[PDB]
Amino acid sequence: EVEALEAKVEALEYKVQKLEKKVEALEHGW
Amino acid sequence: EVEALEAKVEALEYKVQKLEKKVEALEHGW
Amino acid sequence: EVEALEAKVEALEYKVQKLEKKVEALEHGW
């Protein structure tokens, strides 16, 4: 259960970093 | 503590999937 | 490993709440 949590958290961090970049582009009009 | 982590990770995955859909709509102009 | 997971999940929750606010502003044209 801890290894499952670790993989899903790593996948969320990647997905969150992707969202942050996309939203910054939207906010800044890049 | 592991069960708390599991519930919060499941809630983050739902919230992240909601954000992904909303951002795709914004990016694609849907 | 559980404490590392806890800190990273807390950081994701903050980052996700920031994204939610920013996306709501984008969607509502605030």
Concatenated DSSP letters for C2-30? HHHHHHHHHHHHHHHHHHHHHHHHHHHT-
How far is C12 from C27, CA to CA, in rounded Å? 22
Determination approach: X-ray
Structural domains of chain B, count:
1
The C-alpha atoms of residue B17 and residue C25 are separated, in whole angstroms, by 18
* Subunit partners of chain A (3 or more CB pairs within 8 A): B, C
Query: Is B5 touching C (CB cutoff 8 A)?
Result: yes
Domain span holding position B25 = 1-30
Residue type, C26: L
Are the Cβ atoms of B8 and C5 closer than 8 angstroms?
no
Angstrom distance (rounded) from CA B12 to CA C6: 13
